[PDB]
Design a protein around this ligand. Sequence first.
Ligand code: HEM
Length: 84
Amino acid sequence: KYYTLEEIQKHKDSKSTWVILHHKVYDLTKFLEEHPGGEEVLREQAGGDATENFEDVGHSTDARELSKTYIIGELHPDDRSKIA
Ligand code: HEM
């Protein structure tokens, strides 16, 4: 399902904490508490083009593979050229 940067940007933190990861929207409004690096790193990239600051962070493949378990959406076919 598509989502626009607007809705994404709203959903930073507290009960709606979404991330655009490799052109794929995951909500992670819970995992905030769970991540070994806690909220901060998620929060600061939430409602954002986290694609990059996610996979470039030296994440182990593991942290990527679970990523494709969730998927609430992809994105609008315009925002597709912002993530870059
Ligand atoms: C999809 C859910 C994610 C999972 C399950 C996950 C899992 C992990 C794991 C297992 C590590 C530790 C790697 C190790 O000890 O070798 C890690 C490290 C890290 N993650 Fe994530 N991660 C997720 C999402 C994110 C996101 C979205 C960000 C922010 C953009 C992020 C930022 C970081 C950072 C900064 C570190 C390392 C910091 C340091 O070395 O002190 N993670 N993650």
